[PDB]
RNA sequence: AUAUGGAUUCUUCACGGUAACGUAACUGAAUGUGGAGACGUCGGCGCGAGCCCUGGGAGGAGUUAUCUUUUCUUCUUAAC
């Protein structure tokens, strides 16, 4: 009956990431010491990869497949859950409550997320997650 | 016309905030969409400015047989 789990894919509705697809890593159903509301820890895409055709060269294909990730704590009311899923075990440990409140630790976590997303995009799977929403 | 400083990049084209949004900056051609320019009249109410009225004090002037701590006057601050 509960669908907000550690593999659910959601759509951000507010906060400079509106219209970006995101995946839930760690949910907190009953608030916390900070953020006194239902919220989840998510990792998403800030810059979707561009479309690739057969005419593009090797140097151009690699440039158009770059993905810029982000990490954010989002209220439940600002998320639109979907029916799609994406396993987060490759970067579940690095993204946690401790990775915040530290400028340097946030950068290291996002580098791990970028590696996982780029490998996920290669050998195409989770195609709906890597396709930008049009609105 | 152009240099310097700052900002950005070895995760190439910035970060923060749950959010409304914030900042010294923080690539964007064709094409497309939207906003501003851009609007009647009357009625009462709220607020601002200039003026009017008035107290104390620091100056100048007038009246003074008698009365009047009194009558008149100066005390200002632009765009940006």
From Swiss-Prot:
One Gene Ontology term from the biological process aspect of the record: cytoplasmic translation
Compartments, record wording:
Cytoplasm
Q: Which GO terms describe its molecular function?
A: structural constituent of ribosome
GO cellular component terms listed in the entry, alphabetical order: cytosol; cytosolic large ribosomal subunit
Describe the subunit structure. Component of the large ribosomal subunit (LSU). Mature yeast ribosomes consist of a small (40S) and a large (60S) subunit. The 40S small subunit contains 1 molecule of ribosomal RNA (18S rRNA) and 33 different proteins (encoded by 57 genes). The large 60S subunit contains 3 rRNA molecules (25S, 5.8S and 5S rRNA) and 46 different proteins (encoded by 81 genes).
Cross-referenced PANTHER family: 60S RIBOSOMAL PROTEIN L27
Q: Which family does it belong to?
A: Belongs to the eukaryotic ribosomal protein eL27 family.
- What's this protein's function? Component of the ribosome, a large ribonucleoprotein complex responsible for the synthesis of proteins in the cell. The small ribosomal subunit (SSU) binds messenger RNAs (mRNAs) and translates the encoded message by selecting cognate aminoacyl-transfer RNA (tRNA) molecules. The large subunit (LSU) contains the ribosomal catalytic site termed the peptidyl transferase center (PTC), which catalyzes the formation of peptide bonds, thereby polymerizing the amino acids delivered by tRNAs into a polypeptide chain.
The miscellaneous comment for this protein is: Present with 7380 molecules/cell in log phase SD medium. There are 2 genes for eL27 in yeast.
Protein name per its UniProtKB record? Large ribosomal subunit protein eL27A
Q: What is the scientific name of the source organism?
A: Saccharomyces cerevisiae (strain ATCC 204508 / S288c) (Baker's yeast)
What gene is behind this protein? Answer: RPL27A
